Design a protein around this ligand. Structure first.
Ligand SMILES: Nc1ncnc2c1ncn2[C@@H]1O[C@H](COP(=O)(O)OP(=O)(O)O)[C@@H](O)[C@H]1O
Ligand SMILES: Nc1ncnc2c1ncn2[C@@H]1O[C@H](COP(=O)(O)OP(=O)(O)O)[C@@H](O)[C@H]1O
Ligand SMILES: Nc1ncnc2c1ncn2[C@@H]1O[C@H](COP(=O)(O)OP(=O)(O)O)[C@@H](O)[C@H]1O
Ligand SMILES: [Mg+2]
Ligand SMILES: [Mg+2]
Ligand SMILES: [Mg+2]
Lengths: 321, 370, 370, 370
């Protein structure tokens, strides 16, 4: 019952330790601090306050279980689908990269492939959310759709979406037709989306910058200054640095922020091999994602050296700054 | 970063990035507007169709080419085309790349100036450059001396170069190219009762021309051959399932290239124009010109064209000269190819027109820098 | 609140709310008046009968259709019908509901204007609209391209649409429909000696037509089969208990759709009308139309109609085209279903004609809005 | 002896003798066949009707025009019409007269060849000739310089001539003529509830057109005038005694000559067609073409047409050239009059295709001698 192990939030700490203990803090406020630390190691914080434990807030107690379980459903990580780099075949790499971006951003329907994915407004509308554009949900409807209430009502939503975006305009999207989502023209398809992702990244730069787009120099400078707190590795030198083995140092920087549950027995010295690099590519991504990083890059950057993507990690790092 | 090569022909749009061996996007240079009554709600929202979508749905649209005889006649639609190519076909931000553009010779200068203004003010590109198309063709060939015969959809022009230098006084241009041949084919298709009148039918007949026409080596012999036997007849299936048959027009159309009076034109044939251009040059370089005759453009893709030109110019030569025709398979893109080459050069990077320069000298700067 | 979809068909009235999958009410478009002495006090006070009441009591009534060939010929009776519709069949207050109305193309304009005035003044509807019936048929199919063949009780018309656009010059209309088939069946039934001359007898013949007739795939060998054997004959029972028998009339009646000369009409068959409508279209969309042939209306409910059309249109097509006919089970309500669909759309809500606009433009407003 | 002049138009047949100032025989170019069951012995033996007797008995006949758009589509009926012309209307033996025929430009070659073969092998004429109708029209005007606009029942075409020389590359043809206007009028007659379906009713509508239609000098204000007042309304009496009234379609039908979009065609109007034909000619002769715009054919007989043409061309002209249109009252027979003039000239007598030349060269001789 609630008064047994829930009024004190006793079970939640064991749950948090299961998905990462905690109950040993012996005091409600110390336990809540432990909960915040566990959240720092898990990323599930959306609404947590000390009243959940100190005052035993039943609304908070009943609400936070969703954050605990939905984010960690038996650790069924969708990236372990991407570990099959071509889990589907025939799609171009660029499309795969955009798909990954949407996957990282938590769009509620799951990704399958770019041609089937985004055949509806709901997708692009979720995108519109991430760009903070307001949405008239009253004009937004349902997905299953019967013979009555068919693709035509879908079309209502679809062209609605094209009025959207062109509301603040500037995205040069005039050529896009409101009926073409059903049509699915390939270049039209890619056109309407790539700029979106670019815009988002621009937003990221502005967000982590000092009121403007962040510059390359301050990136590595802050990284190294943080690295100075953990300088077992020398530094990061350039975005064009071929010695991608330095990825281990990215993880060490992570360790600097939080040493929790990392595998440095998995970690190997600078004389790495390509298999180690493949291992690293996914492992680092996983760690970052679980910490809370909205990782936009594909793991291949650890073997392909793409300067344009690496900033993804440093973003969340600066956020922790 | 990387420069952009856009070859804005009269008939086809050719574009891509520097350093590549082929253009990434090739599509017709047309704009289509609906020509009938929209009746289903939501469907009629689209006023314009630009690239290959215009061709597919041509059945309900009126087709306009923004370029005729290589002069941009509709400037708003040209903007539509450039927007389309930048954002849709290549999907890049023009503010981040220098761009290379092409032009035919003997053109009105304001055409050049306006395209400059557009690039710098609508797209505000970092830098740009405009080049003559035949020059790029030569660049595509790896040679430094020769006369280039260029024939795309709207203009035919000849340019000679010796050791990297052109000779402008001998430059000759003929407003006679593929589109006119198409119109003439329309004209003569009625003789068998085949009628095509609309802009959409024009594409059908252009396809017809591109698939069934050829260059005879002897016009009178082939005319007699057709007059005697049907061995030259060939058949074509129209989009609705109708099949038509031609065997005489398959060559009467390209002959206009050597007989412009067919369409009432007074100008001389391509062989003769080439020859006269050669005769306007120094007697000392003509021999080298005779050995390097370079052709480019889709209208230069007819079967037998190289041999016919070989024979004709041999007939015009002092007979002690050697006549050599150069006709690579990639003729269709030699312009864009030479452009990619040129733009990829480290030395060219100082030849770009920068926005700063434009901001002071206005659009006129192009006449100085190009 | 919610909208109303009333398809005043030539012989049948189809109606209901927007959002439902079937017209809530369906009844004959008739008015009856007594023709005999009312011998009982109090029972004869009712001067007119409208819906199924008219049909059930037809034994003592003279029946009339206010609409013929899709033109409203009796407006007062039509008003009776609309009153019955809304108040007795729907039991709704029209002042609270916008209303969607239907019409065949190529109709006299005054028909449309008068129904407009009626709705806004007699009924004072908040808003309304008049749409072409075949368009609704296409809405019902979920397509945006195809040709619709619609055949009700008064008119048979052809409408081609490509991508939500129609071609008015290619629209075909034929004043030959089910009522005509019924009258011709009445005529031919005299050769066996059966006679039907009164208005109620016509209803009986209509039941027979809807019960025993069919379209022959090839009429000639069918006539031969009926001439030799008797397997085609079938029997029907009259209300008094008499039985009649027919074998040959079962298919000679629907054949007039393909041979209008049976009733002396010079016009060509429905297949031929379809094909010619196709040929009036731009060559570039004919293939898709050939693939999208939509049937609609109670008359097209004959068994074998689609196969016969398939055969015939194949016989006319260039044989490379893939002929396809679409014949859903709910053909009898395709128009009304499409209307419900359309009324259900938020984007359509601004397309209504409000009474306010009418108060400015009079009934002529319909020609601009619809 | 003397030459026969036969102008075979799409709608009307003009025939006579050279040197006469008017055709001796003018009758419709039709063939009629019965479409009903004959019931009186000895009356149904006649299988076909050709001349004005077909027109008078059209109520029981189906009417076919052998020529459509200046193309002979049925040759057996064409032979019937030629037999009627020679033996019934003119009552002469063709074996004793050289014969001059007419044809439209941009026609298929088989048409001219087959008429040559028919004349030599069926009617066994001694000599023949095929002339261009517009050229004959210039002869009738007593001129050697000007651009001719010929408009009959099937074809509209333009031919510029300067000092006796044609400019074939500037000849333009439009398949829009009086028959199409008749069909359009039929379409728009239904707005008021008038219906015409039968080929005989088509002739009825053609009569209505020839009587009540005129050309508006400004279409947009004539529409407003008709919208606000009934002053333009006019009445017509049907053969059965019914009376119809039209007041808006009178100018809507002929406006199609300037707005072919009304019938769904992409092409431009007659005024722009003529202007383009002129702009295709040499800049030196354009003033003379502007001052000599010759009209011909029955379709050019509408009231107000010459004024509208002068106004539209003036709008298209550089405002310095004066614009003059020549429209003689004998416009309906200008082609035939010019034919009689040409056949009467002594310098023309060496230009007949003699039957000996035909016997040694086949039907293709007409291409070389005409
Ligand atoms: N195989 C072919 N045979 C004959 N003509 C062709 C062929 N391919 C293309 N053409 C014609 O050549 C033109 C090709 O356009 P292009 O050479 O790109 O001209 P532009 O440089 O003006 O765009 C088209 O007008 C087309 O009609
Ligand atoms: N099963 C059937 N077989 C043949 N004819 C039918 C059938 N059902 C209905 N009809 C005919 O269809 C007509 C009614 O069709 P409908 O589309 O409702 O016409 P309207 O729109 O004019 O009311 C009637 O004349 C009837 O004869
Ligand atoms: N006064 C008139 N007003 C309008 N149209 C006319 C007039 N007279 C004749 N027509 C039309 O002109 C056509 C016949 O013209 P004509 O030049 O004789 O044709 P064709 O060249 O085929 O003989 C018919 O379609 C007829 O309707
Ligand atoms: Mg080009
Ligand atoms: Mg119906
Ligand atoms: Mg004529």
């Amino acid at each position: 019952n609630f008064s047994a192990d829930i009024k004190d939030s006793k079970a939640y700490f064991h749950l948090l330790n299961q998905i990462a203990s905690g109950f040993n803090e012996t005091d409600d406020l110390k336990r809540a601090e432990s909960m915040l630390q566990q959240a720092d190691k898990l990323g599930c914080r959306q609404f947590v306050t000390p009243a959940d434990v100190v005052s035993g807030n039943p609304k908070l107690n009943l609400a936070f279980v969703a954050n605990l379980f939905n984010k960690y459903p038996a650790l069924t990580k969708p990236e372990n689908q991407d570990i099959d780099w071509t889990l589907l075949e025939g799609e171009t790499r660029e499309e795969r990269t955009f798909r990954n971006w949407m996957n990282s951003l938590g769009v509620n329907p799951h990704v399958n492939h770019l041609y089937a994915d985004l055949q509806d407004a709901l997708v692009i509308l979720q995108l519109y959310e991430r760009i903070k554009v307001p949405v008239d949900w009253s004009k937004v409807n349902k997905p299953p759709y019967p013979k009555l209430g068919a693709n035509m009502k879908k079309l209502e939503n679809c062209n609605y979406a094209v009025e959207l975006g062109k509301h603040p305009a500037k995205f040069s999207l005039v050529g896009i037709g409101g009926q073409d989502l059903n049509d699915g023209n390939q270049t039209l398809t890619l056109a309407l989306v790539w700029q979106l992702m670019r815009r988002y990244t621009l937003n990221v730069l502005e967000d982590l910058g000092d009121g403007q787009k962040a510059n390359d120099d301050i990136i590595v400078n802050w990284v190294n200054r943080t690295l100075s707190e953990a300088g077992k590795s020398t530094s990061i030198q350039s975005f064009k640095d071929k010695t991608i083995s330095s990825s281990l140092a990215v993880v060490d920087l992570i360790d600097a922020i939080q040493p929790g549950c990392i595998n440095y027995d998995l970690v190997k010295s600078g004389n790495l091999t390509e298999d180690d690099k493949h291992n690293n590519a996914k492992y680092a991504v996983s760690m970052a994602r679980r910490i809370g990083a909205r990782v936009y890059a594909l793991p291949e950057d650890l073997v392909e050296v793409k300067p344009k993507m690496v900033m993804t990690v440093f973003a969340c790092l600066m956020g922790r700054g | 970063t990387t420069a952009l090569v856009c070859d804005n022909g009269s008939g086809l749009v050719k574009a891509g990035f520097a350093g590549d061996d082929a253009p990434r996007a090739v599509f017709p240079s047309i704009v289509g507007r609906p020509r009938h009554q929209g009746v289903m709600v939501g469907m009629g929202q689209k006023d314009s169709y630009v690239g290959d979508e215009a061709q597919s749905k041509r059945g309900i649209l009126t087709l306009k080419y923004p370029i005729e005889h290589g002069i941009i006649t509709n400037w708003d639609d040209m903007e539509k085309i450039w927007h389309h190519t930048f954002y849709n076909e290549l999907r890049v931000a023009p503010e981040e790349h220098p761009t290379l553009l092409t032009e035919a010779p003997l053109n009105p200068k304001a055409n050049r100036e306006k395209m400059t203004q557009i690039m710098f003010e609508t797209f505000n590109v970092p830098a740009m450059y405009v080049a003559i198309q035949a020059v790029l063709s030569l660049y595509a060939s790896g040679r430094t001396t020769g006369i280039v015969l260029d024939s795309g959809d709207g203009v035919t022009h000849n340019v000679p170069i010796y050791e990297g230098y052109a000779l402008p006084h001998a430059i000759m241009r003929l407003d006679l190219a593929g589109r006119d041949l198409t119109d003439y084919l329309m004209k003569i298709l009625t003789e068998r009762g085949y009628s095509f009148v609309t802009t959409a039918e024009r594409e059908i007949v252009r396809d017809i021309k591109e698939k069934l026409c050829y260059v005879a080596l002897d016009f009178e012999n082939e005319m007699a051959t057709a007059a005697s036997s049907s061995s030259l007849e060939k058949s074509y299936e129209l989009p609705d399932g109708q099949v038509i048959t031609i065997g005489n027009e398959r060559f009467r159309c390209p002959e206009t290239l050597f007989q412009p009076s067919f369409i009432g034109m007074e100008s001389a044939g391509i062989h003769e124009t080439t020859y006269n251009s050669i005769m306007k040059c120094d007697i000392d370089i003509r021999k080298d010109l005779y050995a390097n005759n370079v052709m480019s453009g889709g209208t230069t893709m007819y079967p037998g064209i190289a041999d016919r030109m070989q024979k004709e110019i041999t007939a015009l030569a002092p007979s002690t000269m050697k006549i050599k025709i150069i006709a690579p398979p990639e003729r269709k893109y030699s312009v864009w190819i030479g452009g990619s080459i040129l733009a990829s050069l480290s030395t060219f990077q100082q030849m770009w027109i920068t926005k700063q320069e434009y901001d002071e000298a206005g659009p006129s700067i192009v006449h100085r820098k190009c």
